[PDB]
Symmetry: C3
Subunit: 444 residues, 3 copies
């Protein structure tokens, strides 16, 4: 059951520690989602880089909805009539649905269609807003993150004909600063010093993100769509329809802004017919479309969520990330690193350009384990020139079936082509080649 992970083929650098006036270190690079194994001269010590996370501080929060809008207008032929005035309809709310918010607009200087030729009619409206399908979202401002690696340390013994887990701990290490060090084992003999070369290869930009909220205010996967900061009131972007301290929704500064967004005009004054539109985005009917979550659209994002109910940090878990630098240090004793052979029976897949322009090789490896080297060819011919080389990693100790996404450079354009896969150290004779089809989704 509990077994060592695939032990990765790793070059080891022996570094000598500086002298104390009154010591060898084993240095190596470790890949995200991979493990490195060693014995101390007996337990098999394994270190797996399990996670790469950005912890973004949340500097603003507000709750918003998507309004369902209806405008009800009345026309008056006589400009001097007590019905329809700037008093009652210019910069004022409708007089007192409990969930509705209602703002008034005034349109004098209308054309006398349905009136006398000497009349200058006036149109007066109530612009009603209700939350569409009672949807609620939390808007958050995310700022520059702190970075953390999660390592899983596990020591194994092979007794009674099976591997047995002798010790297991999760280790957390901040990556933005200098070398971070601590004891690895329960006996405190081995230490793990973690050094990042620099900032994680990917990062979510500073700005506005959002999550759908439940009745209890429970959040989910973060989404990105043009969204107002707390101090912004741009009607082309999300967040102009906000919930107050009570669960009541309002058009942000609606009393004053209504005359800027509500566009209306008389068709026939007597018939009480008129033209009316909202000059804004993100409302119902017909002006709202919800983006899919960040994790669905970004191959590099495994997850992007708000950490807990205190709503202080958002955590982005990376599916892709550069290697970390490790230094293993310690009676007189020697460390020996071990790796497992890599293997592959077959593969299948396709070359994809998705609706967001991600150019990927969607790959499934069969009965595979460890380091798999791949070559993308110029055409369908297995002997045609190589235009791209990559390496995929399968962390399972035993031959497993696994699906993965391999980013592809732009040179890998339209059309079917050959892709050849080969397990690390295997001869060219043991490569697997297949003609792989191309599928391009239009930009949506």
């Amino acid at each position: 059951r509990a077994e060592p992970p695939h032990c990765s083929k790793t070059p080891i650098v022996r570094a000598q520690t500086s002298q104390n006036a009154m010591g060898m270190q084993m240095q190596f690079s470790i890949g995200l989602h991979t493990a490195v194994c060693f014995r101390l001269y007996s337990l098999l010590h394994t270190i797996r880089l399990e996670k790469l996370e950005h912890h973004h501080p949340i500097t603003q929060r507000y709750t918003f909805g998507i309004p369902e809008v209806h405008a009800s207008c009345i026309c008056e032929c006589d400009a001097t009539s007590s019905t329809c005035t700037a008093e009652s309809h210019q910069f004022t709310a409708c007089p007192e649905d409990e969930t509705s918010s209602c703002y008034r607009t005034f349109f004098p200087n209308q054309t006398p269609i349905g009136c006398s030729e000497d009349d200058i009619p006036k149109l007066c409206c109530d612009v009603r807003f209700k939350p569409y399908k009672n949807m609620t979202f939390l808007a958050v401002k995310l700022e520059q993150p702190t970075t953390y690696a999660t390592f899983v340390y596990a020591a194994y013994d092979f007794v009674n004909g099976y591997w047995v887990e002798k010790d297991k701990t999760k280790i957390r290490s901040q990556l933005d600063g200098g070398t971070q060090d601590r004891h690895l084992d329960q006996k405190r003999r081995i230490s793990l010093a973690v050094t990042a070369g620099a900032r994680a290869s990917h990062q979510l930009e500073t700005g506005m993100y959002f999550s759908r909220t439940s009745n209890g205010g429970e959040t989910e996967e973060l989404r990105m769509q043009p969204l107002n900061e707390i101090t912004d009131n741009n009607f082309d972007r999300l967040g102009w329809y906000r919930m107050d301290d009570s669960g009541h929704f309002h058009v942000n500064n609606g009393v004053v802004k209504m005359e800027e967004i509500h566009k209306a005009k008389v068709k026939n004054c007597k018939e009480q017919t008129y033209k009316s539109i909202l000059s804004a985005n993100h409302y119902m009917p017909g002006h709202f479309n919800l983006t899919r979550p960040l994790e669905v659209i970004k191959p590099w994002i495994q997850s992007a969520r708000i950490f807990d109910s205190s709503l202080r940090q958002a955590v982005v878990t990376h599916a892709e990330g550069t290697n970390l630098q490790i230094s293993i240090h310690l009676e007189s004793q020697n460390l020996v690193f071990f790796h497992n052979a890599s293997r592959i029976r077959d593969f299948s897949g396709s070359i994809i350009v998705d609706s967001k322009s991600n150019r990927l090789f969607n790959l499934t490896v069969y009965e595979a384990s460890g380091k798999i080297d791949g070559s993308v060819k110029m055409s369908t011919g297995f002997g045609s020139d190589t235009i791209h080389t990559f390496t995929a990693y399968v962390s399972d100790l035993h031959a497993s079936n696994r699906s993965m996404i391999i980013p592809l450079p732009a040179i890998v354009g339209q059309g079917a082509r050959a892709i050849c896969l080969r397990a690390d150290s295997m001869a060219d004779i043991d490569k697997i080649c297949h003609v792989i089809e191309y599928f391009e989704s239009p930009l949506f």
Copy 2:
């Protein structure tokens, strides 16, 4: 007095230089704010990574203020009266306080409150703007930076029972490109080659920043608050009230924009009472709040200033940054690296979540020096599981009292918990544990 810094425990890699058809290098990683020491086989050579700076080019500048606003309105009952017209009050400045700027607005189609029932009154206003407390700020657009490390090289001799500084130079090295090399010592025997793994762990985003300015235009610590670029005229953001080539302030395109931002309505025409507001942000009274400087709110920022009076570059000094890669190269001779022991008597502190959502351990170490390894526990019990491990560095050669900020991952939530500190290489018996209290400031 002038003494070597704490010599950091450093793993050294011996690299062999490629052959010239017609040479050993000492390689190591160096942490920001730390020093590495060596002897050449006698002077004690010390290299300290003193600074990490981003030099951002300034691509736009303009001077702005915070206006103090007052609207003075007059009402006229008779729509055809020569008093209050589109001629005199629509898209025009007030006729000619020397520092004031005055823009006019026109509101016809008013309700006859205080007039006859057949009247259609008109309201006319003067909207006056003055600089609040004569405050001046420089808006700057900062673009992608160039990166520089500052090293302090200092060679020491121990004669007459004391250390004496034999040589000292400041060394500057660009980090964005390839390996940068130069001679270290006065005798030109030792060379320092600096290689960054990649871009500095933190960076100030491209965009608009600002500084308060004095009478002489002297700048200070940079601040970040939504602010218009030179070509933008968004009234929800700072910078719409700009100073011209003379020290005169104007509402940017005020003559044309006034009718969009000034919202007014008659209360009683005869009584000369009316409602009036400005639909904009960042003005007085009651619509202005100044953000604290970037250095105060961002733990990673030690300083963010405009370099000099030419106003061409902004310099961001980093409080946190990844390690740099060093190669020391050179008659036949050998380099020996030395380190000092690490020590700690005690510590105090608290776990803090500030008003900007920075999750930190505010730490004070007592009589400490060198490398200090810390463990954050699951609960108040000193033997409860470790949820986070970190390392702090104290660069003082002698036991010193120092305060520092340690970023914490989100798993370190609410509540008091134990934190244990231990100097590098000390036995578990020499660790110091304390129950540390939690304090969370609400989001402001």
Copy 3:
């Protein structure tokens, strides 16, 4: 003709591969635009890091123009006249130049200049838009990139008194993830494993970019200027004048927005004289200025283009970038690395602060090759303190004349100063010093 590149002086680290239960690697850092050479113990194997590219996915596209604008207005003295009404001129297009787009505006409540004192005139306009000089541009939204290094591998034999190229291949390697490996030579004996320390030192921010388009929709060098996203309709930014599925240009939501951007007022009603302006940016006459391409203004950008006619990815080629980490691995045999001597006859140049605040040393080296170490001095005196040290690389095997841009830190302010250059390993006696002039272009 076809000759090896300059073989760079490189420190080599020998790493030992982990053991397989059933192997030495040669590790080194390689600089962008440089080459490393070795022999296997005979062919001279050369690896050149030729390119660093970001492949940005394009998530939005739209075609836009720069409108040439003309407003034609008519005044009517009598407010009740059938000529000039809200019906015909408020929120409507002009009635049906084939390329023109025409939107109407209505301005009642005018002052009776040229009318009777009891008249309340009305102004009616046609606001016409045509594409200025038939210019077309493609707006693109660029998102976070994938990173690729291009290596040129070339093996040389020296027979018949000349170098002869025995093999040459271009190698592509993704940098965002883990170690990428493949065979280097035709015989598959040597392998090249590429590891990036982290994300490329520079990156183009997520956002809106544009390119001029030809008749066939052919793109060119990308430019950056405030530009609307597809869902934005901000008149202070580019892209509000868009081309539809036919080659026809429209003011985005022009029918509704016209009353917000067209500002007009009667001068004399009878004379048919009036004031008229567009409250917007990026139109002709007098309100349009085109930024120079990204590659021209950013020293770090060699090129920034749309890859091909499918318009799915934009490719940014970097002129500056950090080193990559290489591991060369393989019968029992040994790898020996070789380098060429560095040389320089003379140099010329100037210190420049351009119109975009880039602080650079514009340098020309004469009869130079390899590694050139430079020192920037405090004053004009050749013996004055060094305020900055840098290293430039010339990849040509033979002494060549080459121009380059060296970024300078802000400490290198105004005024003439000495700069001293010296080829790697040359004695201080062989340095070349010149007093170098300062030229600062004002901020434009």
